[PDB]
UniProtKB/Swiss-Prot annotation, chain B:
Signal peptide: none annotated. It comes from Escherichia coli (strain K12). It comes from the Bacteria. Homotrimer, with large domains that extend into the periplasm, interacts with AcrA and TolC. AcrA may be required to stably link this protein and TolC. Interacts with AcrZ. Part of the AcrA-AcrB-AcrZ-TolC efflux pump. This is Multidrug efflux pump subunit AcrB. The gene is acrB.
Swiss-Prot record, chain D:
It is a multi-pass membrane protein. This is Multidrug efflux pump subunit AcrB. Homotrimer, with large domains that extend into the periplasm, interacts with AcrA and TolC. AcrA may be required to stably link this protein and TolC. Interacts with AcrZ. Part of the AcrA-AcrB-AcrZ-TolC efflux pump. Residues 1-291, 292-580 are periplasmic. AcrA-AcrB-AcrZ-TolC is a drug efflux protein complex with broad substrate specificity that uses the proton motive force to export substrates. Belongs to the resistance-nodulation-cell division (RND) (TC 2.A.6) family. GO terms for biological process: alkane transport; bile acid and bile salt transport; enterobactin transport; fatty acid transport; response to antibiotic; response to toxic substance; response to xenobiotic stimulus; xenobiotic detoxification by transmembrane export across the cell outer membrane. Induction: Positively regulated by MarA, Rob and SoxS transcriptional regulators (at protein level). The chain holds residues 39 to 865 of 1049 of the full protein. It comes from the Bacteria.
Length: 156, 577, 578, 580
């Protein structure tokens, strides 16, 4: 596709908000994907760069882009405790029950790292509380296994 | 220059964090009671390599330093993983540079670099090691290993795994004491005395191919060649070397302390002349460096492969061999090697010039050549490629409070972003190391493995042995002891989907695929972890702006450094100590 | 002084005889071919520890001696138990006395004695140990390990044993080399190269707690936290320290043979000044013993004395310096469990620091008079040798020359001591330097009964040892630092003889078998500290010339007395008497 | 003479090739990057022994040479077989020849050769070995081990194997770390603190004999003494010494490189003086070789020769000095199974001590005249190189395999060079190999397909074979307070003839006893009982003399012309006297 594709992946990767605007403006493919299938929105979501997430979404970035293992930007934001990104992704239409190749959902991941504020927002937006991964496990099983009583309360 | 000792260890198939936390930390923690130590630095990388460099006070006797470091390392050896102990952990004086680099090439296209490396190992290196005034000699490549390249589909067909393969090779490529008939103490009057000779080490691909893995219930035999391809090959494949586009190996030769350079160089050249009658066809000796060699760095992006780097190095070689045909004798292209990082995405070209007197005029001097090379290489896409001939400062950012790699990177980026705000005082303030890159995280599900009766050892040996390789034991090749390695044939260990082609046998004999008890995902992590005086570190280089002193640049770095998050410290090293 | 090289090694849960016979004898037998060795001595202790002291002729290059020693030891390492090898054997070339002590307290009481000791172990000790001139560093405390405190009732409920716990920890707290995607040699056209990351070391009690021991036949899960309490705690619990009565830890530092005291102390201070800014709040360095304005006090209780009775005596010592001598004494740093020469529940040391000389005017407020008064004040403490000393009669070794054994050598020692007590005009205070035998719990495993039940001896001995002695399983990463993991019974299931009967082992047929079905036990005596001298069993005797009598006359009488000892008992002079 | 560091290792029951290929080569490959090294040589023997000699430039600091050798050795140590590591690999910096021999005898004849050798190993050797200036100490004999001599009929009668014996010994001769009652951290208030003492090492044959191998279904017990004889005995039985025909042991002592001979000898005597008052009755030190006054006699039979045939030649030598030279000779200390090239069944040595200078008047009664007559009298002993001498025109030649030709081709080549040197008596005298010839060996092939089919494991097959016919060091025990080894091996009468292979049974997975003959075949073949290597390549040392009046220079030069015509791949180098 584009040389600016790769520059945008790199700039989103490294949190360079200004370099990201300038590249958006010059036609850089907003859904350019690297070798593992990560888009700028994936990278910005994983590394916690909120402004870049926002700029990209406004420029039409595919909110539900999936990587080669089926994981979406919301999987990454939920897993790495980035609350304000989780909220924006879900507001711009992120699929709250997206499953990866393993059947893992953003809820499973937030639950596993005990990100409680994130777990609440996911349930706010309709996250399926009884979704099973390929092993039969729910967010509730994950709370029991990790002995995280606060998270057990929240999932009843 | 202050004397330095380097400890080198290798853990095949290990990632940077595995190496650090099972080797590097353990060794660092045992570097006490050593005299005259100024500082210690280490790096641990994704090629399974650790290097710990100890730097001693100027005037320290380097041999005493070496021996003290050695003894402490050797006492710590039982604390290290078996796989690392079996590779040898070397402790060498690292301060000195090469007397000469000797290239060994094949010109008539009959021999791979592994063939050549083996020839050198077996016929050349030892006679060079014993030559007058020679010290350390490094081989560039290895002697052959017997390579067993496994096929998962054939293994699953016959309900076998890599574990069965490794067990069978230990059992059938063996050599043990069997005693004697009529040995002492004997029945008195015994006339017959003879050694008993039982199994002996295997000597060839044919013999390995006949290893019996299993007799089926129908009475058919499964032999090792039915689940694997079998060849003599390299111990490892991280480096590809060419000399003017031809396959190469070589020797890196060091001068013994208090020996003469010119007499040693002539004594080596003489010794190498004696061997020339015995070469096979087209083997040839070349001398890329001997007491105007410059270098060209090649750096591809995160995740880039050996083949992509090779393509770029090939463009670099072709350029010097055509656009500088009047100036350039040779290009020695080393794919997988850099200073500041090994890996599939780096390489370095050693360019050797023709004589001063055959390059008249300033256009044909090194400085003009290098600037032209750099201008030409600037229009290669998706590679940074820099020609250079071999002031600054050397800073270490230090994790002082158990912050972890991720928080240390964020502090590093806080300092680098601040140093950029003062271009009046500082320029080119940059990491010396590497950035985190995508990695494939596989979780084994312990409950599923238990339910199914799949053992975790079987799981982890199957994954490790197939995808990383395993040094099983030794064999004898044309009378010389050499290693035996099991690994997946390349096309079954390339991509995530290949993980599910590998099967493990449960306790009830059913074959279970990897996907039944595992899940995976992409994440970032480090391909090269750095430590300084036993603590996690990130080295940062830089220089004073124009018309400012190094001392002034340092003062600002310290001041910027005082504003970093809690638990982040620093120290000055190297040129800046 | 004759240079001394010291080898130290450890075997967790081993008694003196075990240490002596699997470690000490083996190292000793292999100290051949070393130049200028004058003599060799060793202790094998019921703390699971051995110290071998090799003393070289005067003028020997200590560098060379250390190296020659380390090289012989390296060649013997494969003959030692895996449990000892894996602790790390150390070899040192240093003074036996302390150059200085670095104390560490928490001024805001935010951190316990145990937290502080770990902070010191984990953040300060190694850089101090790498400082040039630093010969030996003793932590006055222990680094944390991950402690798995097993409950035998809960293990038996789920038909598990410590063997199953250990197996599961090694399998689930693992660091796995998994290779790469697109690894070399690659296929043609490969675009992706990435490390594969599988299992990594666990980092938290949470993680160890969810180690999955087993899935019951009804599908429920038995996690490690269901049979154990999981906490960070010391690799050992033997050494506790206080600074002016407050919780403390610290580093006792000994000068490397031939090093410069003053430069080494300065380098140590320079290194501590690099660490101070990153301390957690409250943490503070104090300087309780800088070597004339300082002295020590030794506390030796008889073997068999416990941590609490040693503590009681240390409290009396500390109290005296902080009440009676408060106009002269600035501080006391007291260590329970360490005693200058040796390490044990029955021993302690106090490091005393005086106020400025200028503010202690008068002969009666100088070191000599103070130590002398303190020795007098402590001379009437019951069943404790307590003495204050700044830092010569005779030093005698009774030697087992003919395989006589411990018991006979003790009788022979006692005969010589009794004979020497009957010459009070010639000899004074002729005494053992070592320890008396004490009660020990002898347990006999019935091999016939184990085999009849299908119980494996290795499971029995691993069960006994791991529970009652502790077992170092493998390593984990605590806040980025490699540290150890230990399994052991929780305290309350390993206190009394009846507790033996509550440990169960699983037979080949799946039945749980109590230890009482295949064992029997009795009380007996044995040694908490076995000594050797030049490779043979030995007993060190100290003493002096009586008043008005020469050392050489006293020695001559000791030789006379020694010549009438039972057959096979020899002797030799060492130390000051060589 | 140039300084030499020596690496020595042992692999019990190993043949020469096995030693070479699992031990010697692995070490050798690391011996480079060592300062002032001139050359390296090695022997790998069918006694299961390897010795590598690294020879340094004159004036090299021996302390540093030893250090640097050992640091390269450490790279090979974890690649070595565990049976080698466990024997204790040694690295020494000694002179190659003896400074003195300390003899030990029992004037009351109440102790055998075996008893005496054990007493010396257990109470005397270590302290000598620790003495400064002592480079190497050789025991003429062997320390006692606990010997379990297995009987294969009795083992098969109870469905047991050596694997079971070895397993039981490891389980029941054990030293257990069992912790404490009331240890730390305690329940606060705990008063009781006591060490737990569980199993401890066995100390006696009686305790070994009652080891419980199994309980039958009927409840009867199979004890280790029901399948083996149990006694104290040598770790090995290869070295046997006599002093004036009387049972003896001793220490052969070599001087550490650069150490003072007088000083060192004196400290050895001082240390012996500490031991003497505690000797059992009858025991006494004798001094059969102080370094004219003395000389040695070397005895070398051809490979294949047993202890019996070597003893015979030694008796003829000893008989000579006690009958014919009885007015000159005070004492003969004769050692069967150890000679100049170290250990082997076909070698021996006599140390001869003469009476006082002044009780031997006349030039024919001096060392030179005596050794000449002895060498003369011994020259007609057949199948024996016997000579007497007291400690030059010669050359030291190394034939080297430089192309992977293998041992058989290198022999062929050697024979070709030796035959052509025989046709030049004008220039070359006594051109001979320094080494040993190939001898018959019993080659046994495990059939993997049969083993797998019957369900017998290969480790079980190999242990059974190795332990029975070679012996196996199981673990340690305590003999009269001293750590010592425990060995299992077949009783002699079950490991003497080829048919004995078939009386050893291995137990399959299904419980069936399977004789060795069901999964094995065998044949005679030839191989080497001493493989030599020079600078890391297979080699064959050839010795010889400049013919009368001709220079070493001219004889060396001829040997080069002869060598130049040898097959492709075969090279040479000069070592020792010929190096410079
Ligand atoms: C003096 C200089 C700068 C010159 C110099 C040259 C040249 N010319 C080469 S040539 C490439 C040889 C080779 C062949 C196969 C595999 C790896 C390397 N290689 C060097 N290396 C040093 C570290 O190990 C290998 C690379 C150096 C470093 O010192």
């Amino acid at each position: 596709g584009s040389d600016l594709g790769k520059k945008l992946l790199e700039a989103a990767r490294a949190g360079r908000d200004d370099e990201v605007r300038i590249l958006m403006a010059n036609g850089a493919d907003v859904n350019a994907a690297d070798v593992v299938g990560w888009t700028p929105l994936h990278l910005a979501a994983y590394w916690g760069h909120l402004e870049i997430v926002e700029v990209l979404l406004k420029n039409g970035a595919d909110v539900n882009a999936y990587d080669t293992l089926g994981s979406t930007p919301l999987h990454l934001a939920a897993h790495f405790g980035h609350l304000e990104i989780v909220e924006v992704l879900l507001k711009n239409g992120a699929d709250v029950n997206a499953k990866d190749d393993n059947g893992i959902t953003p809820l499973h991941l937030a639950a596993n790292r005990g990100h409680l504020e994130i777990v609440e927002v996911l349930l706010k937006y309709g996250a399926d509380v009884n979704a099973q991964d390929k092993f039969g496990k729910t967010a509730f099983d994950i709370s029991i296994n990790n002995g995280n009583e606060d998270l057990a309360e929240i999932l009843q | 220059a202050p004397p330095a000792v380097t400890i080198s260890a290798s853990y095949p198939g290990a990632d940077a964090k595995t190496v650090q936390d099972t080797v590097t930390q353990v060794i660092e923690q045992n570097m006490n009671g050593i005299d005259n130590l100024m500082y210690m630095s280490s790096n641990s990388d994704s090629t399974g390599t650790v290097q710990i460099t100890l730097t001693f006070e100027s005037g320290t006797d380097a041999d005493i330093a070496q021996v003290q470091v050695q003894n402490k390392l050797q006492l710590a050896m039982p604390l290290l993983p078996q796989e690392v102990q079996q590779q040898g952990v070397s402790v060498e004086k690292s301060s000195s540079s090469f007397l000469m680099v000797v290239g060994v090439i094949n010109t008539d296209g009959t021999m791979t670099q592994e063939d050549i490396s083996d020839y050198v190992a077996a016929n050349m290196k030892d006679a060079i090691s014993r030559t007058s005034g020679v010290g350390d000699v490094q081989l560039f490549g290895s002697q052959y290993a017997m390579r067993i390249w496994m096929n998962p589909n054939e293994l699953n067909k016959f309900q076998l795994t890599p574990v069965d393969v490794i067990t069978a090779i230990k059992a059938q490529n063996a050599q043990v004491a069997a005693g004697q008939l009529g040995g002492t103490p004997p029945v008195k009057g015994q006339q017959l005395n003879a050694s008993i000779i039982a199994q002996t080490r295997l000597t060839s691909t044919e013999e390995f191919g006949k290893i019996l893995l299993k007799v089926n219930q129908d009475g058919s035999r499964v032999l090792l060649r039915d689940v694997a391809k079998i060849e003599l090959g390299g111990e490892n494949y991280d480096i590809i070397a060419e000399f003017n586009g031809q396959p190469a190996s070589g020797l890196g030769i060091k001068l013994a302390t208090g020996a003469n350079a010119l007499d040693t160089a002539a004594a080596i050249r003489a010794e190498l002349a004696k061997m020339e009658p015995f070469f096979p066809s087209g083997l040839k000796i070349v001398y890329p460096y001997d007491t105007g060699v410059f270098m060209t760095m090649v750096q591809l992006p995160a995740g880039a492969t050996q083949e992509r780097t090779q393509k770029v190095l090939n463009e670099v070689t072709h350029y010097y061999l055509t656009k500088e045909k009047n100036n350039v004798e040779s290009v020695f292209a080393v794919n997988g090697f850099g200073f500041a990082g090994r890996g599939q995405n780096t390489g370095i070209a050693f360019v050797s010039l023709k004589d001063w007197a055959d390059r008249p005029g300033e256009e044909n001097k090194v400085e003009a050549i290098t600037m032209r090379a750099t201008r030409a290489f600037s229009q290669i896409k998706d590679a940074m490629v820099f020609a250079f001939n071999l002031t600054g400062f050397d800073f270490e950012l230090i994790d002082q409070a158990g912050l972890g790699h991720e928080k240390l990177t964020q502090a590093r980026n806080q300092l680098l972003a601040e140093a950029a705000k003062h271009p009046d005082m500082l320029t080119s303030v940059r990491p010396n190391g590497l950035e985190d890159t995508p990695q494939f995280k596989i979780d084994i599900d312990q409950e599923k493995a238990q339910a199914l009766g799949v053992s975790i050892n079987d799981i982890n040996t199957t994954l490790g042995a197939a995808w990383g390789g395993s040094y099983v034991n030794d064999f004898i090749d044309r009378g010389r002891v050499k290693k035996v390695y099991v690994m997946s044939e390349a096309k079954y260990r390339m991509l995530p989907d290949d993980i599910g082609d590998w099967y493990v046998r449960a306790a009830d004999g059913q074959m279970v695929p990897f996907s039944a008890f595992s899940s995976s995902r992409w994440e970032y992590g480090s391909p090269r972890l750095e430590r300084y005086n036993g603590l996690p570190s990130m080295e940062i280089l830089g220089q004073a702006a124009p018309g400012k002193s190094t001392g002034e640049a340092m003062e600002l770095m310290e001041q910027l450094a005082s504003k970093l998050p809690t638990g982040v410290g620093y120290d000055w090293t190297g040129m800046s100590y």
